[PDB]
Enzyme design. Structure first.
Site, PDB file in Angstrom:
ATOM      1  N   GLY A 160      53.351  47.635  36.562  1.00 45.39           N
ATOM      2  CA  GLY A 160      53.471  49.003  37.055  1.00 45.39           C
ATOM      3  C   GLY A 160      54.024  49.979  36.016  1.00 45.39           C
TER       4      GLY A 160
ATOM      5  N   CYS B 250      52.641  50.479  33.148  1.00 46.75           N
ATOM      6  CA  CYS B 250      51.478  51.014  32.438  1.00 46.75           C
ATOM      7  C   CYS B 250      51.362  52.503  32.599  1.00 46.75           C
ATOM      8  CB  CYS B 250      50.214  50.288  32.877  1.00 46.75           C
ATOM      9  SG  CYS B 250      50.321  48.514  32.597  1.00 46.75           S
TER      10      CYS B 250
ATOM     11  N   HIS C 225      42.559  51.201  32.841  1.00 46.71           N
ATOM     12  CA  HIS C 225      42.577  50.038  33.720  1.00 46.71           C
ATOM     13  C   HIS C 225      43.139  50.349  35.110  1.00 46.71           C
ATOM     14  CE1 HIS C 225      46.668  48.981  32.065  1.00 46.71           C
ATOM     15  NE2 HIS C 225      46.892  48.702  33.348  1.00 46.71           N
TER      16      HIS C 225
HETATM   17  O1  LIG Z   1      49.950  43.722  31.139  1.00 44.42           O
HETATM   18  C1  LIG Z   1      49.931  44.277  32.236  1.00 44.42           C
HETATM   19  C2  LIG Z   1      48.641  44.440  33.017  1.00 44.42           C
HETATM   20  C3  LIG Z   1      47.421  44.177  32.162  1.00 44.42           C
HETATM   21  C4  LIG Z   1      46.992  42.879  31.906  1.00 44.42           C
HETATM   22  C5  LIG Z   1      45.956  42.638  31.014  1.00 44.42           C
HETATM   23  C6  LIG Z   1      45.327  43.692  30.372  1.00 44.42           C
HETATM   24  C7  LIG Z   1      45.733  44.978  30.660  1.00 44.42           C
HETATM   25 CL1  LIG Z   1      44.945  46.319  29.870  1.00 44.42          CL
HETATM   26  C8  LIG Z   1      46.760  45.236  31.548  1.00 44.42           C
HETATM   27  N1  LIG Z   1      51.034  44.743  32.858  1.00 44.42           N
HETATM   28  N2  LIG Z   1      52.284  44.284  32.480  1.00 44.42           N
HETATM   29  C9  LIG Z   1      52.898  43.150  32.913  1.00 44.42           C
HETATM   30  N3  LIG Z   1      54.082  43.032  32.405  1.00 44.42           N
HETATM   31  N4  LIG Z   1      54.224  44.148  31.608  1.00 44.42           N
HETATM   32  C10 LIG Z   1      53.137  44.937  31.622  1.00 44.42           C
HETATM   33  O2  LIG Z   1      52.900  45.954  30.996  1.00 44.42           O
END
Ligand SMILES: O=C(Cc1cccc(Cl)c1)Nn1cn[nH]c1=O
Ligand SMILES: O=C(Cc1cccc(Cl)c1)Nn1cn[nH]c1=O
Lengths: 304, 304
Positions: free
Chosen positions: B143, B145, B41
């Site tokens: 961030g 990720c 992503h």
């Molecule tokens: O969740 C996401 C982005 C995302 C949103 C939806 C899907 C996917 Cl693959 C990635 N970031 N996020 C926010 N707070 N903690 C953390 O890890």
């Protein structure tokens, strides 16, 4: 989101761990620049530990009696000296892995990460608080002596603790990096009183702010309190008295959540007086005091 | 003595973290040998995340669109490919800091350390368990990720997790290092059901053994139980059913303490049925399930 008991990344400290052997005793040392720091009790045998005369025990030792090994390689010891309860072994090689560092003496209630080590090898890392009574509740077995506590501000490691001993109560005692014990402790195998401990109020309030930020808010109520009223409750429940300096440090968290510090104090008062009623806050069934207000801000903002 | 939620020393993993930027998106990558692994992503914008067609989004990207920075230095990307939910960016330089490593897919109930990172920089390390429902309860902000989970066996790092997302419930989901999600999750900003979670019974029993070793024994009783009887209680309280394989893994702890596994099950049964009555076990007011029997043995023996 989510809130965990997070330790600092330990890489900069792993690069400083060495094994120090003197006679039959092996423990950990911290190699920074051309000096290796370790607990002075590395020079004691089991018999000596009941009442060691460290000055006399050190006089029987020469530079060549201190075996310092940085994993694979042996360091050459060219000087030794005792400063309070630490030995400083001057070596002929500066540690190539020495990070930017400071030696700091932390205050009770402050937190730090510990890199538990055995035979100069890191086994694990955990975050803990220096109790108000100057003990730490760690995880240290025989041979963990010399393992250190630290904090990291960007690229600078502030070393604040070196482990020396486990009290007969199972709690831990140690020194700053100049070898001064935190608390009344002496490096002798004798029963030693750790003072009455208290709960770190400012940290519990910081953790309640972390809980509100991260979604747990069942404990918020319609009440407020005053510092005097709250401190009468803090007294009954063996919590540290809250001061305006603690309220001030909670300022940023109060601003971020919109919950006035005295209003959070009223939530804490009700939790002290009524318990959790079988509920949890950030996965805990007790009031957590090992996160400072700085820890909560750092964790909630993603500082690296 | 003492028992803490200990993470592995993170140094070997810190040396592998890099920042990966694609367009407007920045996240963390893991550089091992001449490959950088990161969540696929990284190629999405905010609009894309509602239902991304990753294959089509990746076709608009060339090697030069992936900016990989290892702190100070820029890596040259000479290949890119998507494997499940991860991108593998071939770089022209092998990471000089690549430790001995393996990619493993862990089982639910197993534990691991997470090195939380932002912009390729490590912020902290914590230990956690893969829930039976394949989520983790981490501490991950925007961030984070690309931050990874791992275990260490002497000098070998087994990477088991890469963080991809936070579910709307605040729990975390991610993949193994081949990009396969743990659990039913997909990398899309859609509400996704995490299954019914359960408590990891074998870990709670391991932790009760750690408690007895470390001095906390108030919960031991005059009773015993059977696997069938215990499992009727495990059922009522949403605990994983205990099997002979779990009893077998608890063997070493049962041998060290002299407390038969079914006798510890009877202590656990009484704690489930009666609660802690306002008492604590190893500083916790709930039944802890984030320590495997291997974790307890490792921590209690001082493995490095
Ligand atoms: O969740 C996401 C982005 C995302 C949103 C939806 C899907 C996917 Cl693959 C990635 N970031 N996020 C926010 N707070 N903690 C953390 O890890
Ligand atoms: O406590 C000692 C040795 C010692 C005993 C008495 C005094 C001194 Cl300075 C050192 N080691 N130890 C044992 N379990 N945890 C731990 O740190």
């Amino acid at each position: 989101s989510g809130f965990r008991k997070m330790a600092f990344p330990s890489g900069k400290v792993e690069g400083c761990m060495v094994q120090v052997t003197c006679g039959t005793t092996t423990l950990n040392g911290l190699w920074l620049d051309d000096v290796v720091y370790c607990p002075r009790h590395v020079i004691c045998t089991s018999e000596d530990m009941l009442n060691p005369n460290y000055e006399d025990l050190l006089i029987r030792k020469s530079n060549h009696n201190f075996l310092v090994q940085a994993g694979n390689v042996q360091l050459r010891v060219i000087g030794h000296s005792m400063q309070n309860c630490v030995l400083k072994l001057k070596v002929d090689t500066a540690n190539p892995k020495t990070p930017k560092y400071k030696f700091v003496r932390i205050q009770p209630g402050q937190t730090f990460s510990v890199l538990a080590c055995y035979n100069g090898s890191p086994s694990g890392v955990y975050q803990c608080a220096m109790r108000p009574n100057f003990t730490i509740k760690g995880s240290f077995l025989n041979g963990s002596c010399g393992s250190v506590g630290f904090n990291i501000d960007y690229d600078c490691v502030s070393f604040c603790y070196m482990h020396h001993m486990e009290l007969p109560t199972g709690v831990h005692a140690g020194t700053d990096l100049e070898g001064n014990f935190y608390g009344p402790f002496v490096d002798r195998q004798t029963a030693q009183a750790a003072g009455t401990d208290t709960t770190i109020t400012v940290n519990v309030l910081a953790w309640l702010y972390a809980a509100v930020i991260n979604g747990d808010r069942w404990f918020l109520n319609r009440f407020t309190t005053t510092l005097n009223d709250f401190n009468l409750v803090a007294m009954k429940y063996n919590y540290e008295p809250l001061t305006q300096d603690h309220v001030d440090i909670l300022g940023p968290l109060s601003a971020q959540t919109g919950i006035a510090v005295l209003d959070m104090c009223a939530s804490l008062k009700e939790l002290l007086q009524n318990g959790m009623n079988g509920r949890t806050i950030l996965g805990s069934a007790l009031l957590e005091d090992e996160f400072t207000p700085f820890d909560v801000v750092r964790q909630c903002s993603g500082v690296t």
